[PDB]
């Protein structure tokens, strides 16, 4: 099946796409404000043939000037100067297409060529172009240098890192970077041909020596396991700490990493790491070092092995104080044994004799992320992260988003932070050459 083209959606009235500036990790986000509706650019002339003389060895492409009418994610609606109607307006992918600052062609000694449809309007287009372009906005000359510098991943193939075992989430397992697409890494577990996709900014991948330092469960080859126990000796293929994104510093804590914030037994809410459509009561099972802690989803069946425990850092945007769902009108997943109609936090804390973790332990500042209900975007299927799909913002709960996959039932909706690295602007797949899943037939 083919990758889904946004084209028919773009060609509809009131189509709403989240702007690139909503996605901090997205390429071009930093310089995107240098773009604007009404700006003028040199763009490829598709409506002309061998009018321009091209010497052998030169690129056989001709350019004309256009105005950007609309911007939807990476998509821009172009309109050639000289046209009276919108008959030849066309959509482009901004960071794929040959779009340039006005004056780019002249630097290469190339002339601008009027499209055939309007070429007759003038013998010399100087007066028209001077009249249309004087005082107008165009692209900064360094624009695409900035874009290209934002395409490269911080990682490369062959790097070894510790990442969560999808078959046993209570431990991290040694894995190697074998594929990179648009900064989404494929990590193949050592001594196996299985693995998973995740963005380079994912909180479930960690540098070499992380598990040992933090105190997380670790599965790895013997030689690696024994190398960790000493300390600490380095290796050429070790993924180091500066490659990894954190919203905190190891210096915030002491050198020993002793933390006394979250405590074992404390109750809270959290997104089910095995079901991103669900938010349910959770319990701190073990406090590790440097803010990391193992928690248990209370909706799970009884399990003393602690194999289904999951590590969240205390500054994670995916853990919430008790009462988060009820306060925001979210249907909470009842803890095992309880019913939807028979569950309250007050009664639940009574029966377990437990204490809910205080609001002060949570760090959830709410930015004006700019996300709105109805906005379209591209979102990774967190259940099958090899897939990136057509998606819509269904709800906005402070800084938490409910993301709906267009064409599917609301049961597949996933909870994602506004600054998650699993959501992307419209046109991202085209830019990075990832396949986009469209709505089911």
């Amino acid at each position: 099946t083919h990758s889904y083209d946004w084209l028919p959606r773009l060609s509809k009235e009131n189509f709403n796409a989240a702007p690139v500036t909503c996605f901090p990790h997205a390429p071009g986000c930093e310089v995107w404000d240098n773009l604007g509706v009404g700006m003028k650019v040199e763009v490829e002339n598709t409506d002309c043939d061998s009018i321009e003389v091209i010497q052998p060895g030169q690129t056989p492409t001709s350019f004309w000037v256009a105005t950007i009418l609309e911007i939807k994610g990476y998509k821009a609606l172009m309109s050639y100067e000289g046209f009276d109607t919108d008959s030849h307006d066309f959509w482009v992918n901004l960071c794929n297409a040959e779009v340039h600052s006005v004056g780019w062609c002249a630097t290469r000694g190339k002339p601008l060529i009027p499209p055939r449809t309007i070429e007759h309007k003038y013998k010399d287009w100087k007066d028209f172009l001077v009249g249309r372009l004087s005082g107008a906005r165009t692209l900064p000359s360094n624009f695409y240098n900035k874009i290209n510098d934002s395409l490269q991943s911080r990682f490369r193939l062959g790097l070894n890192l510790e990442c969560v075992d999808k078959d046993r989430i209570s431990q991290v397992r040694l894995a190697t970077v074998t594929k990179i697409v648009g900064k989404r890494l494929f990590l193949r577990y050592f001594d196996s041909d299985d693995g998973f996709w995740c963005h380079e900014d994912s909180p479930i991948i960690h540098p070499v020596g992380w598990a040992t330092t933090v105190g997380h469960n670790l599965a790895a080859p013997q030689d690696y396991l024994e190398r960790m126990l000493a300390g600490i000796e380095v290796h050429e293929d070790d993924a180091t700490i500066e490659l990894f994104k954190m919203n905190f510093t190891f210096d915030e804590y002491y050198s020993d990493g002793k933390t006394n914030s979250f405590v074992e037994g404390m109750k809270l809410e959290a997104v089910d790491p095995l079901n991103l459509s669900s938010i349910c009561p959770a319990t701190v099972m073990a406090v590790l070092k440097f803010g990391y802690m193992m928690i248990r989803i209370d909706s799970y069946q009884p399990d003393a092995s602690g194999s289904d425990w999951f590590c969240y850092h205390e500054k994670s945007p995916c853990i919430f104080p008790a009462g988060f769902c009820s306060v925001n009108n979210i249907s909470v997943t009842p803890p095992n044994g309880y019913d939807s109609r028979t569950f309250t936090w007050e009664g639940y804390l009574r029966d377990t004799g437990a204490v809910a973790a205080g609001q002060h332990l949570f760090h959830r500042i709410i930015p004006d992320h700019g996300f709105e209900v109805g906005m379209s975007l591209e979102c990774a299927d967190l259940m099958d992260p090899r897939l990136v799909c057509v998606a819509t913002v269904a709800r906005v709960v402070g800084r938490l988003l409910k993301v709906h996959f267009d064409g599917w039932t609301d049961e597949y909706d996933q909870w994602l932070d506004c600054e998650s690295a699993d959501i992307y602007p419209v046109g991202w797949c085209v830019l990075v050459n990832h396949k986009l899943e469209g709505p089911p037939r």
């Binding site: 002249a106 010399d124 172009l129 000359s141």
Partner: peptide
């Protein structure tokens, strides 16, 4: 945006056609 808020510059641009060359005064962010 610019010129209201952030940084912007005037930029003189060179344009060629098959009838001649000329200059236009435009602007861009940064």
């Amino acid at each position: 945006a610019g010129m209201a808020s952030r940084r912007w510059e005037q930029k003189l641009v060179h344009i060629k056609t098959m009838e001649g060359e000329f200059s236009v005064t435009m602007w861009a962010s940064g």
